[PDB]
Structure 1
Amino acid sequence: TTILKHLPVGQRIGIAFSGGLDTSAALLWMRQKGAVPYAYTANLGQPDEEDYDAIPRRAMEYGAENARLIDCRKQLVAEGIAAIQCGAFHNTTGGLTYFNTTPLGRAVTGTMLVAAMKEDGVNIWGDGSTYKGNDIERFYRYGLLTNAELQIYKPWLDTDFIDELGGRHEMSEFMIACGFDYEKAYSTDSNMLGATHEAKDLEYLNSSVKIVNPIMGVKFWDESVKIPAEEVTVRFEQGHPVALNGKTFSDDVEMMLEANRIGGRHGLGMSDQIENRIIEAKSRGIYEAPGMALLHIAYERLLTGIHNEDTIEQYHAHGRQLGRLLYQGRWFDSQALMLRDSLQRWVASQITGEVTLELRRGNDYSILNTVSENLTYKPERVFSPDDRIGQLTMRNLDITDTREKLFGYAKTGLLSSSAASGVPQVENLEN
């Protein structure tokens, strides 16, 4: 089988080790019960993490056979930039978008840590994501995709485990009992692309961003917090974000880190979404992604000045589709690769230019300038009145056909046959 319901005694088990209580207690438990756990910690540039190096040490202290720190920032930022280039975001509300930051983190974490484990001769994976969420499924697909012989063991869904220790307090009393010493209004996941806040009090639709203490930006909704308007420039070269406020970077990680600081000072990008889980039930989250939002705005502004209507519609439609696949843990499936590759090659390749913005609070900003060697937009941009008259006349054929259709629809009752207005009246409950 793929999913082992019980602890594989004596077997080498890889654990995606975050360092929290859940994985610490599970690691200690798996060792105590006879398994040989190996710890793998992903450096994802978590904004509230200042000492990634201490994590593998705690894993060793708790029983890990070996513990490694895998740096995933470069790959994370590369995929985040690809998402920006593809507009691979689908959970939107009134124009505010969730930038699929956790989905991106799992795609890189799931593949890189499993590759690292297979490299160390480890073919069993364990991660603390619960059986009720999206993550459990994302890690599942990316892992089996990377290692065909990968088997999954999640002690948290093992009777023997859940039996004795099953709650937070249960795990804490367990650590104490094992000889080792050692709560918000919501849970937070984060990486350098963004932070998500969900569960607990955020489960209630009457809670709001007001109970959140943002970790990548300021509380822009608090009028007492001072936020000076700020001018910012964002420049792209062939789809690559290369300069912020005229400064370049040694690598994309440093660029994204700076994008985060700029948007962070304003709270740019924060949204509140009710979304659909992979298991077709809804969930609610409050999200942060200051740098992604900054790049996304500049990218789209350039896009509107550089590409034609049909190409921009493909960016939107293929982008939304890709966003859903990314969210489902299918970022590397053939249908996703095809959409991503096509958008990167034909849309992003031409995105060269610079956008100037004035940022104030949250999502309030203004566009101040747009420049590009590739613009198809031109001020006061060729044809005569007579050329237009002919073009207008060529429309008569189709207008006549449409007029006949309206007559036919009125006849069959879809449009009111009695409309002393001139405005066709569609016959449904709303009109």
Structure 2
Amino acid sequence: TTILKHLPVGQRIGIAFSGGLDTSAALLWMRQKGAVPYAYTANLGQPDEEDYDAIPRRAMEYGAENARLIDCRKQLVAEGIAAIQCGAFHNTTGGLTYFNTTPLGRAVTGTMLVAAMKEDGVNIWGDGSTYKGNDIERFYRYGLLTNAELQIYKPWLDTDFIDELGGRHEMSEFMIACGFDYKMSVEKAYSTDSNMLGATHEAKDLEYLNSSVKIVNPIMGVKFWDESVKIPAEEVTVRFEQGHPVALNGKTFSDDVEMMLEANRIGGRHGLGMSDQIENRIIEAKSRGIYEAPGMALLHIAYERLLTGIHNEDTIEQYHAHGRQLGRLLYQGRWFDSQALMLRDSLQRWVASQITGEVTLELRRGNDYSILNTVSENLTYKPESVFSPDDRIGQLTMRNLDITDTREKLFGYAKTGLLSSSAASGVPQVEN
């Protein structure tokens, strides 16, 4: 089968070693039960990571046959920018958007780490995602897409493993019993997946709808909800060239990673982009999360403001429709499937290519901001004798036949009982 239920003794197993008790304990346990574990750590520019080079060394200290750090920042930012160009975000609440940052991280991580293992002749994969979430399926799909011969082994789902190593306490004691003066970190009231595009918090106390953003200590921005933290209003300019974010506050960057890093700083000072979403997981059961994505939010606002001053209505409607559909595919782990690529490619080529301009905003607290200026050499919006009042009288008169058709429909609907009353005496009323 594709998924190995129990430890493949004697075989090389590649595991996404993010570091931390779960992956650390798994390395020792696998190495202990007879498997040859290889560690691969993705450099995703995590806002809460300050020493990536130390991670592969810890894997080696714990028995890894070999350990590698795969830099995925360039690809992550490129896909994040593509997501921005396509408005590929489907989970919204009252307009506030989740920027699908974890889904983007998985697309890049799942393909690059598996490709890297491919290089080292490692054909068995394993990551710590649970059998209850979306990530296990995202990694599964991206991995198999990259390596047709891939097999999956998740010690965390192996009954043998769980029997021995139940929870965090058993695992930390396991580290100690294995000869390592291990000291487990302080446990938060929620779990977090983070990368340069965003941080997603959920589980534990965030599973209760009565818990709010107040129990969260943001890692990409400030506590804007705390009236005691001072946040001075700030002006920022975002400029695009053919849809590509090239300048922030008039400054260009040597690469897009530095640009995103700066967009994150600007947005973070204000807590821009944070939202609270209840969403539908791939397995059709709901999950609740609190999300951060300051840089993505900043670019999203500027990009759409320009879009509204540049494209026609049919094109904007298609951008919203295709973007929402693509956002869902991205969330499902299908970002590289034909149905996704066709929408992504289309929006990048025909919509984003014309987004050249600059937007000036004043950021205050959280999602409270104002648009101060909008400029573009491609605007179709023009403050300024192409048509006359009489031309409009003609255009209005052309509507008469269809208006009559609708009036007759309203009469018909009232007749068959659908409407309480038509437009004859006022506002049509749908029978209740």
Report the TM-score when normalising by structure 2. Answer: 0.98
**CA deviation after TM superposition for structure 1 residue 188, in Å:** 1.0
In 1, are the aligned partners of 2:43 and 2:52 still within 8 Å (CA)?
Answer: yes
Asked whether the equivalents of residues 2 and 151 of structure 2 are also in contact (C-alpha less than 8 Å), the reply is yes
Compared with structure 1, are the counterparts of its residues 254 and 175 closer, same or farther at alpha carbon in structure 2 (3 Å cutoff)?
same
Any idea what the Cα deviations from partners look like across 1:280-307, whole Å, max 9, x if unmatched? 0000000000000000000000000000
From the superposition, tell whether residues 381 and 112 of structure 1 become closer, same or farther in structure 2 (CA, over 3 Å): farther
How far has the Cα of 1:417 moved from its partner?
A: 3.7
Alignment of 1:265-284 (within 5 A): 265-284=269-288
What pairs with 1:327-338 in structure 2 (closer than 5 Å)?
327-338=331-342
- Provide closer, same or farther for how the CA distance between residues 184 and 340 of structure 1 changes in structure 2, counting only shifts above 3 A: same
Give the Cα–Cα distance (whole angstroms) in 1 for the partners of residues 38 and 324 of structure 2.
38
SS at the partner of 1:367?
Answer: strand
Please give the secondary structure, in 2, of the residue aligned with 1:234: strand
- Rounded to whole Å, the distance in 1 between the matches of 2:35 and 2:421 is 78
Q: Partners in 1 of 2:343 and 2:271 — Cα distance?
A: 31
1:420: Cα distance to partner? 8.1
Between the aligned residues of both structures, percent identity stands at 100
CA distance 1:402–1:222, shift in 2 (3 Å): same
Shift of 1:380: 2.5
State the shift of 1:100 in Å.
0.3
Asked whether 1:287 is paired with 2:291, we answer yes
SS of the counterpart of 2:162?
helix
Go from structure 1 to structure 2 and tell me whether the alpha carbon gap of 1:44 and 1:403 turns closer, same or farther (over 3 Å shift).
same
Change (3 A) 1:154 1:208: same
Deviations along 1:152-193, one digit per CA (max 9) or x if unpaired, are: 000111111111111111111110110012111111110000
> 1:255-404 maps to which residues of 2 (within 5 A)?
255-380=259-384, 382-404=386-408
Partners of 1:52 and 1:134 in 2: CA distance = 26
CA displacement 1:298-327 (0-9 Å, x = unmatched): 000000000000000010000000000000
Change (3 A) 1:419 1:372: closer
**Cα displacement string for residues 398-421 of structure 1 (whole angstroms, at most 9, x for unaligned residues):** 001101111110011111148885
Which residue number corresponds to residue 209 of structure 2? 205
Distance 2:422 2:410 in 1: 13
- Does the 8 Å contact 2:16/2:113 carry over to 1? yes
Secondary structure in structure 1 of the residue aligned to 2:419: coil
Q: Which deviates further from its counterpart, 375-384 or 56-65?
A: 375-384
Alpha-carbon distance, 1:272 to partner: 0.3
Consecutive unaligned residues in structure 2, runs of 5 or more: none
**What are the residue-to-residue correspondences of 1:141-156 with 2, within 5 Å?**
141-156=141-156
Cα 1:16/1:382, change in 2 over 3 Å: same
- In 2 relative to 1, CA 122–394 (structure 1 residues): closer, same or farther, beyond 3 Å? same
2:411 matched to which residue of 1? 407
Query: Aligned equivalents of 1:63 and 1:381: distance in 2?
Result: 78
Q: Following TM superposition, by how much is the alpha carbon of 1:385 offset from its aligned partner in structure 2, in angstroms?
A: 1.0
Contact 2:237 2:359 in 1 (8 A): yes
Which of 197, 211, 215 is 1:193 aligned to?
197
Is the 8 Å Cα contact of residues 76 and 108 (structure 2) preserved in structure 1? yes
CA distance in 2, matches of 1:135, 1:67: 23
2:367 aligns to what SS in structure 1? coil
Instruction: Compute the TM-score of the two structures, normalised by the length of structure 1.
Output: 0.98
- Cα distance in structure 2, aligned partners of 1:109 and 1:416: 58
C-alpha separation in 2, matches of 1:381 and 1:35? 79
Equivalent pairs, count: 428
Summarize the Cα distance change of 1:153–1:381 in structure 2 as closer, same or farther, 3 Å threshold. farther
Partner SS, residue 3 of structure 1: coil
CA distance in 2, matches of 1:118, 1:152: 14
Residues 422 and 428 of structure 2 are in contact (CA less than 8 Å); yes or no, is this contact kept in structure 1?
no
2: distance between equivalents of 1:214 and 1:361? 14
Distance 2:267 2:112 in 1: 29
- Closer/same/farther in 2, CA of residues 74 and 409 from structure 1, 3 Å limit: same
Residues of 1 paired with 2:88 and 2:9: CA distance? 42
State the distance in 1 between where 2:159 and 2:203 align: 25
- Matches for 1:94-173 after TM superposition, within 5 Å: 94-173=94-173
Q: CA RMSD in A?
A: 1.1
Q: Name segments (4+ residues, structure 1) moved above 2 Å.
A: 417-421
In structure 2, how many angstroms separate the alpha carbons of the residues matched to 1:125 and 1:268?
37
Worse-superposed segment, 379-388 or 167-176 = 379-388
Deviation at 1:381, TM superposition (A): 8.0
Shift of 1:277: 0.4
* Cα distance in 2 between the residues matched to 1:417 and 1:257: 59
Structure 1 residues 418 and 393: CA distance shift in structure 2, 3 A: closer
Q: How far is the alpha carbon of 1:382 from its aligned partner?
A: 1.2
Q: 1:325 to 1:420 in 2, by over 3 A?
A: same
Distance 1:103 1:310 in 2: 28
Segments of 5+ residues of structure 1 without an aligned counterpart are: none
